[PDB]
């Protein structure tokens, strides 16, 4: 051949049990509102209700884990203190 690849340096990202089909706290979906929102509108009044990203690479609706931080702390799918390394998908 005329051009042959010798080296490569991809960077491979990884995800924990974010369950893109079901938030593990309320069980609705990674997106598509939560149990404490249901209707898209439901008097949105600014604020938000997107997705929260932990340091342990777990994902839930921002409110679900904020309400879970009033019941416990260590992210439910492990034993690591839940952090907020992101906001939104």
């Amino acid at each position: 051949k005329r051009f042959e690849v010798k080296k490569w340096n991809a960077v491979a990202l990884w995800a924990w049990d974010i369950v893109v089909d079901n938030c593990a706290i309320c069980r609705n979906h990674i997106m598509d509102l939560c149990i404490e929102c249901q209707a898209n509108q439901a008097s949105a009044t600014s604020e938000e209700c997107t997705v929260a990203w932990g340091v342990c690479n777990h994902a839930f609706h921002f409110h679900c884990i904020s309400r879970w931080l009033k019941t416990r702390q260590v992210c439910p799918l492990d034993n690591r203190e839940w952090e907020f390394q992101k906001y939104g998908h």
């Binding site: 490569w8 491979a12 439901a42 390394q85």
Partner: protein, 364 residues
């Protein structure tokens, strides 16, 4: 102007890009002290930290061995200037760097084991976390080269045979490669963008825009750019020439290849990316809305964490405190915080009854 902190960001960028500004190590310490002193009299630290993290991602996901020692000085100056907040985020990102290098060496070891497909002749895979590292894009799914196909398949099989639960995601908007071309054998360089087009050329030459847009399925947004990185606006080191010489990009234009013996070595790279700092409207405004959402995060978190152990407000009592806590972060933004504190009502977590603004629920 908020463009002044964006400009301190671009200063950091070009400064660490040079990686030689001030050969004397003493002049380096002094210039860094002067830089942090200049940063001391600066507001809007959120965009500063965002662009500093972006520059960290740009300097760590590229050719290594930039300084290898100044990172400790940088994180120490951040600890002593900003505090233990976004610098703790930086420490998490450095732990991520450790994780990546360790996983890379482990996978090279496990490839010296099977070595069935020759797809991974020389490989360098990095494992990072969707968190620390900023949202790259929508994980592009364009046709990938085959020896790289075999390498990625082997890596995914290994990562699923051991680290089950950590799903892998394929993308193209990151990394590099060394394309061994062949009168001598000069090795080129492709930053994960020209690999697919050059592989399609290897399979069959004499292609055009239609061929690379039909049988490749690549996001048009980030496709025309790598197309021109390979042709439009290239010095006399052209590795991908065309017959219809023109600035704008057409559809039916045949692509060819030239020798260009001006490369006085065997490792010639095409560093068209990371050009002069333009900071176009689209990306800039996107990141600006992202940092506005980040300031929203800041205010909301501050409120829910502090007002759980403090008193209640009547009209504008606790807003003064929540602005004083964020005085060293950014502007108070009275309208934004006033519009956002009244959204919590329909979600509890510090609802703040508006009409019965006499006693707030001190519960969880």
């Amino acid at each position: 102007n908020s463009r002044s902190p964006e400009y301190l960001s671009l200063f950091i960028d070009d400064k660490l890009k040079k990686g030689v500004k001030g050969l004397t190590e003493q002049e380096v310490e002094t210039i860094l002290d002067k830089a942090m002193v200049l940063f001391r009299f600066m507001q809007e630290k959120d965009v500063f930290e965002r662009y500093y993290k972006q520059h960290l991602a740009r300097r760590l996901l590229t050719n290594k061995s930039v300084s290898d020692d100044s990172e400790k000085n940088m994180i120490s100056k951040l600890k002593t200037e900003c505090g233990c907040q976004f610098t703790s985020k930086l420490e998490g990102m450095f732990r991520d760097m450790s994780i990546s290098n360790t996983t890379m060496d482990e996978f090279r070891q496990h490839l010296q084991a099977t070595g069935v497909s020759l797809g991974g002749v020389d490989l360098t895979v990095r494992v990072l976390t969707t968190g620390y590292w900023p949202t790259q894009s929508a994980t592009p799914k364009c046709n990938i080269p085959p020896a790289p196909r075999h390498a990625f398949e082997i890596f995914r099989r290994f990562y699923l045979a051991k680290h089950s639960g950590r799903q892998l995601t394929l993308q193209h908007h990151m990394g590099s490669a060394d394309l061994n071309a062949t009168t001598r054998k000069h090795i080129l360089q492709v930053s994960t963008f020209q690999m697919t087009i050059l592989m399609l050329f290897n399979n069959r030459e004499k292609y055009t825009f239609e061929e690379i847009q039909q049988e490749t399925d690549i996001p048009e947004r980030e496709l025309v750019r790598a197309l021109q990185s390979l042709a439009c606006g290239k010095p006399t080191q052209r590795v991908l020439t065309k017959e219809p010489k023109s600035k704008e990009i057409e559809n039916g234009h045949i692509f060819t290849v030239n020798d260009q013996f001006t490369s006085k070595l065997h490792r010639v790279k095409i560093q068209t990316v990371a050009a002069k700092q333009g900071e176009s409207d689209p990306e800039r405004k996107e990141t600006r809305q992202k940092v506005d959402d980040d300031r929203k995060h800041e205010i909301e978190a501050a409120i829910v964490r502090i007002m759980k152990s403090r008193k209640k407000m009547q009209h504008n009592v606790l807003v003064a405190e929540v602005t004083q806590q964020l005085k060293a972060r950014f502007l108070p933004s009275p309208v934004v915080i006033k519009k956002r504190i009244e959204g919590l009502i329909e979600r509890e977590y510090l609802a703040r009854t508006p009409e019965d603004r006499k006693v707030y629920t001190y519960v969880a």
